């Protein structure tokens, strides 16, 4: 195959409590080797591998480069976060909720899959009930699944045995929902 | 290591000698806000919300990518031309929404652990190459500095059609196929 030489620059802003606690880490990467970075908690560029000292020392010796980078914590991280607050952080997409068994015969173990799909943001609460009892064991959940289109999905599975005439419900709470969604599955 | 309520990349910047080619995108909490079409000098936002209320100067990306090109040539010299290592991508296929026959849906092909960031992702329907109804993300960054990429196939679930996601990458000996069908 053809040889490839790869360079990455990643400027990353970490936010907590709005813009009150912010950390900026800029990372300089050759192929997959991060060789220099700026960390606002450190306040100067640092070499991280032997490839880095000529870069870090140069940028630290250029006071306007150094000073501009320090200022980016405010002029980029916090600045752009204000723009996220108007859009991204107000995006609300309601989940669709579906139940299906994983074939179903009465006294035989089965898995009930509550599919919770196409929601944003990521915070969600999904609870299984058997009649009026909340199921706190036998629940197996996928990790949060990132669809790449600014929605998530998650599958929450209940290990159970269909008996007559049990009724199962999946209860979904999400910041997009004024009231929880309740979907039910009835044995036979 | 870094605990935060939110994480942004206000520059995922990429330049590579193969092509050569580059990418400039912003990410917020792991999703791609936009990439800049570097040839057309156009910012391409990834949601209608973003297209109507946000603006980003494409020259910023062009300038940054020019710096990476400069930096890359310095580090090639300093490393005696140490080339990128080909990694083995991991592929998963799943549906966007619960499947019911006759109800339009979307298949999702996640191609993870991509390095270097050069890949072909295509779809097969009953063994036939799919030419329409396919879209994909840019390369999305990962904290180990590989990438992932996601491809989308619009489809109509039926009892007679099955799907494969087909992935070509230098880290693979042959094209990798990931199969999916309505059960």
């Amino acid at each position: 195959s053809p040889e490839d030489f790869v360079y990455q620059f990643k400027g990353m802003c970490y936010f907590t409590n709005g813009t009150e606690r912010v950390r900026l880490v800029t990372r300089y990467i050759y192929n997959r080797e991060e060789y220099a970075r700026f960390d606002s908690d450190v306040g100067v560029y640092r070499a991280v591998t032997p490839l880095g000292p000529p870069a870090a020392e140069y940028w630290n010796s250029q006071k306007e480069v150094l000073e501009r980078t320090r200022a980016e914590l405010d002029t980029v991280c916090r600045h752009n976060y204000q723009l996220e607050l108007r859009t991204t952080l107000q995006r609300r997409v309601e989940p669709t909720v579906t139940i299906s068994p994983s074939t179903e015969a009465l006294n035989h173990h089965n898995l009930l899959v509550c599919s919770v799909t196409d929601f944003y943001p990521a915070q969600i609460k999904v609870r299984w009930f058997r009649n009026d009892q909340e199921e706190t064991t036998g629940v197996v959940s996928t990790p949060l699944i990132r669809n790449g289109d600014w929605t998530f999905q998650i599958l929450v599975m209940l290990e159970m045995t269909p008996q007559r005439g049990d009724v199962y419900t999946c209860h979904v709470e999400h910041p997009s929902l004024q009231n929880p969604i309740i979907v039910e599955w009835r044995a036979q | 290591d870094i605990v935060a309520d939110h994480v942004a990349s206000y520059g995922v910047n990429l330049y590579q000698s193969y092509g050569p080619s580059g990418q400039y995108s912003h990410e917020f909490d792991g999703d791609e806000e936009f990439y800049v079409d570097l040839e057309r000098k156009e910012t391409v936002w990834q949601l209608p919300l973003f297209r109507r209320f946000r603006r980003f100067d494409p020259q910023f990306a062009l300038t940054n990518i020019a710096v990476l090109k400069h930096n890359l040539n310095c580090v090639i010299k300093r490393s005696n031309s140490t080339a990128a290592t080909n990694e083995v991508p991991e592929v998963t296929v799943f549906s966007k929404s619960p499947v019911t026959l006759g109800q339009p849906n979307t298949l999702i092909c996640l191609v993870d652990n991509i390095f270097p960031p050069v890949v072909n992702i295509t779809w097969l329907s009953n063994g036939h190459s799919v030419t329409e109804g396919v879209s994909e993300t840019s390369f999305l960054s990962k904290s180990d500095h590989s990438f992932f990429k996601i491809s989308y196939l619009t489809f109509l679930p039926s009892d007679d059609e099955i799907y494969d996601c087909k992935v070509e990458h230098w880290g693979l000996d042959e094209p990798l196929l990931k199969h999916w069908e309505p059960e």
Binding site: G11, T69, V76, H79 | Y10
Partner: peptide
């Protein structure tokens, strides 16, 4: 208000 971005530091090396 326009989005801003983090400027990539430029290496100083012989061309």
């Amino acid at each position: 208000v326009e989005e801003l971005y983090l400027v990539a530091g430029e290496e100083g090396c012989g061309g």
